Design a protein around this ligand. Sequence first.
Ligand SMILES: Nc1ncnc2c1ncn2[C@@H]1O[C@H](COP(=O)(O)NP(=O)(O)OP(=O)(O)O)[C@@H](O)[C@H]1O
Ligand SMILES: Nc1ncnc2c1ncn2[C@@H]1O[C@H](COP(=O)(O)NP(=O)(O)OP(=O)(O)O)[C@@H](O)[C@H]1O
Ligand SMILES: [Mg+2]
Ligand SMILES: [Mg+2]
Lengths: 199, 296, 652
Amino acid sequence: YSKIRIVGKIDVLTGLHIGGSMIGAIASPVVRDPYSRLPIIPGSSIKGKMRSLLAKHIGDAPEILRLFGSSQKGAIQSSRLQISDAFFSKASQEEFDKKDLAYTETKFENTISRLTAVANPRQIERVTRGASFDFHIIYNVENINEVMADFENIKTAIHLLENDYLGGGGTRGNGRIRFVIDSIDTVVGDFDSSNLSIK
Amino acid sequence: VVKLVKLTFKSPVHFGMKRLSDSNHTIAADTLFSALIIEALQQQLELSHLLNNLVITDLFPYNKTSYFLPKPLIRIEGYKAFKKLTYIPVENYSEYLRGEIDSLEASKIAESLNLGKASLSTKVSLQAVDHNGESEPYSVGNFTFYPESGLYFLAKGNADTIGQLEILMHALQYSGIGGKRSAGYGQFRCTIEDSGKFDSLLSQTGNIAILLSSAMASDEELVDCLEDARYLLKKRTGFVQSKTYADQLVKKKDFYAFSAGSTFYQKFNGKIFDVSDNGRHSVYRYAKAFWLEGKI
Amino acid sequence: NKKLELMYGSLLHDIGKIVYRSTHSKIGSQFLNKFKPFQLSGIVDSVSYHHAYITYIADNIAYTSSQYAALVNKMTDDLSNKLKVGPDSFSSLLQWTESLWSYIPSSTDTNQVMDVSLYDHSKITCAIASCIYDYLTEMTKQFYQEDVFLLVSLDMSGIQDFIYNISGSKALKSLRSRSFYLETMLESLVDDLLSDLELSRANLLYTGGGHAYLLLPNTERARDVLASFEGEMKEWFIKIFKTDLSVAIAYKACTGEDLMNSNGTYSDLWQTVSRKLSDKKAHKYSLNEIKLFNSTIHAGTQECKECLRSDIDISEDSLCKICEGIIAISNDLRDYSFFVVSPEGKVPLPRNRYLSVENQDGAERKIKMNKETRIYSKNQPFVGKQLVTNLWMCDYDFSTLNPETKKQGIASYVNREVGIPRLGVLRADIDNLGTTFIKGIPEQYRSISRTATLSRQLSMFFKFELSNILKGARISVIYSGGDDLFLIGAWDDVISKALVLRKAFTRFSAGKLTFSAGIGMYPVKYPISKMASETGVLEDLAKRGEKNQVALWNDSKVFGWSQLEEQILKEKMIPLQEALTNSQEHGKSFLYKMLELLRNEDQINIARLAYLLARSSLSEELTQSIFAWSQNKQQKVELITAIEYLVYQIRE
Ligand SMILES: Nc1ncnc2c1ncn2[C@@H]1O[C@H](COP(=O)(O)NP(=O)(O)OP(=O)(O)O)[C@@H](O)[C@H]1O
Ligand SMILES: Nc1ncnc2c1ncn2[C@@H]1O[C@H](COP(=O)(O)NP(=O)(O)OP(=O)(O)O)[C@@H](O)[C@H]1O
Ligand SMILES: [Mg+2]
Ligand SMILES: [Mg+2]
């Protein structure tokens, strides 16, 4: 058995509202670390977006189920991609502590109704552009024969995700991200993953 | 040889006890042992050492200052403060056994636990919007440990078993522990080292024995170990997590085991209970006993 | 029927005082002789000698004239018409005594405090007489020194977990019927124990939330009955709820002097009983039961969503029999009045019986179908009905006042023409009530009648009086349970009725009791389980402080009752409202600007506020008061809360 660790950064190109109170306050606060209060990216959001993109490109498919797990009758497969939560990076913490920059921002938005032409204010918290999240992925090499293919699939997903959005109102210009794959280092087993690249 | 294994958690953990919306801050010894069995099966190792000779405790909190232990269930000579109290630091353990801890000290100990903060993250499922219908929102309860805190446990066994446990824990660092370990939770880093304070504490003979792991004895040991002893029967259940058990996920046979901290005047060596029912492989449940002796 | 006559005499031994207020023993004698059924030897002998032997020893161990005359006339009418002598008719008599003599003092025109009511003293005397008679059937100062009594306390384990084993699919119904079914099951346990011991409800000292205290004779037959009842109920609770619910029952044998607070052993006796109960709750199981637990055979394919159990047969819609019965009886418990413990019904109950809520016609039909069918009347002081015991319940729902509103449920509370459409949830309880029971009364004034009076008054206020308290407000009491209160309704009405509840609770018990509450705001579509959990954490934070607090909304708004009623909603909210409605130029945007200024922690904002107040066209007095409030920290958060409340009330 082998497990391949993919570390890197998730550079935010447009304010990411990964979602997840009082009047006149942020109606939809992003998720935060409970103690540090730093905004984070739930690994479930990454896993869901990548699974959706890979499924749309591929098209229940065996590749999607073998990568992202399946509980279906008969075909019980352990998910190979364990995508941990992406936490705020220390470097972005320092870059935002300088220039007294808030870690997040509160975009004010509205919605002109098609009937009365009235607007509805909406204070969406978004992680401010230029914020980097230290994402973390583990790949489970259940079978040595289909590693490369799955990595190709992963690359496709990541490519799609860099042209699509992450969680939030992405079609309205939220959460565009760029993966900076710092390394792909095998942590469990003797499998060699130097020739595999996510991007 | 007893090895202290401290886990520092990089990401919030689920650690469910009966559902998904809750988040216990620890797991029993049976959960950790099942995780070790799953790991030893994935790593193609041999399960003989985990089954025949390995005694582990529950996961217990530990702060920057003190290592915590379960509060022993002993008679008290106010009462609500002691009832709310759950964990006692190692330094204040022998004092608690002798009853020198008053209600104010017990309350201060209960407030001194800085293990972490429990939160509830609401998630969604979009697997129905693509075909037809709506999104299904659910919620996962997580528990984020404070930066200097962690969850520790103790392992006892042969040198070979200790090495195999080190390998399995190294794999578990990235496999994850607790529920939702594939959706971002449960990632941790483990450190295995010789324990000095714990070695002195466990090499202590007392009039009573305290369980440090969720355990239960067979018929022959239970007929003698139930003499005027205080305990807490916890209901250990759950579905089976495997690929080679059944076409659809199948629940285990319900189990009931003494909770950690239960006090027994007679020490019993537990056994691993097979809770499988109509499956291709026996689903083990760890119920061996890790005893710490004390005076009251 | 010597025992029945003795208990009739013991309960009605001090009626002579009542007829005198309109030796009292003789007056009670002829007054009992005025009615043909009440002419048996035991009653008259007890009334005469209480000033038989047993009644005298039990009594030893235990305004305007127009009102007294009217009560005497009513008592005469009830005795002649509705009350008869005979087995199973005693419960009606005891209900009558509880309903009438509660306001009449037991002892009057005495320098000692008249804090013991006639009902309390008569009931205690009847209980002591029953115990003494039972011991003598088993076979003066030496009699007091003799051990003649058992104090029995039975407590329910895991009530809170059982209430909140709800999956959230039908959380409201589950919570309500689970609480009702738990308290009813406790009452059924008490009644079964009393019927086993051949004792009336007078021997049951009192029941709180999942806790019951009652005194019994020291007879070996009583001890064997207690052991058999403990074993049978433990087995039944294991069968129907494996470790989900339990009852632990412990007893301590005491002498006569212990009850009358002689030698100061009353508190020590109760502490010993509590310690024995704690030990029995710690052990809680036996070898055979553990082996039965660990000898499961089949895993079970499917499980109930709420109950989360597989061995019990599961319905098609994923609900076990017990859970399904709870959900089904949830609506009946509020729709009808009578509770029937019959051979067949809707929810399980010990001794192979079933609880079902029916009307009076259903109760009488189930009585006629088979005897040994218990009936409980809910919130009705009439005592003419037979085989009925009054079980208090706070079943107040504003939705049931209309059929369509009943169909809608709590979703009708958020139907508001004005104001923000949200739902308020209130979780309350009393601070240090156990301390009030143990050490609240001074050692000089300790007595069993005293504690019984306090517990009866507390239960009455929590269940019967709470319905009167919330009348006129859109509140659905999810459960008054024991001392804690879970309530859900409109946010405005929830908060207003919480304040009114605090004021009424201060008026009651002479303001020596305090209760902490938490109020939470959630949308209508919000899951009930999350509402309950979050309001519970709010109340936990409120009680974390010192004595009474109200953790309104966000944890940063931990207030006090006087502070919330006056410093927030009175001195600040009302001026803001009157300024808003009176002014023709300013509206909600001005309030939002003030709120934005106040929320900001930077000092310069205060100055900015001043500038706004300069061109606000507001009254000068209100301007200066707002400035003063914004300067001070506590008054700043008070004004923030007042502004938020006004904005919520003025939304839409
Ligand atoms: N039927 C009920 N429904 C809801 N709340 C109740 C009910 N009865 C009592 N309560 C109150 O709700 C709480 C739940 O009772 P619990 O039984 O959960 N507490 P406790 O008796 O101390 O547990 P054990 O040490 O016996 O195992 C009580 O403590 C009361 O505050
Ligand atoms: N309706 C009731 N009337 C009288 N006693 C009750 C009632 N319901 C419950 N009880 C009892 O009243 C006690 C209330 O206990 P609590 O759970 O409220 N804790 P308490 O001692 O009051 O201190 P705090 O932490 O709340 O400040 C219960 O433990 C029961 O013993
Ligand atoms: Mg309380
Ligand atoms: Mg309470």
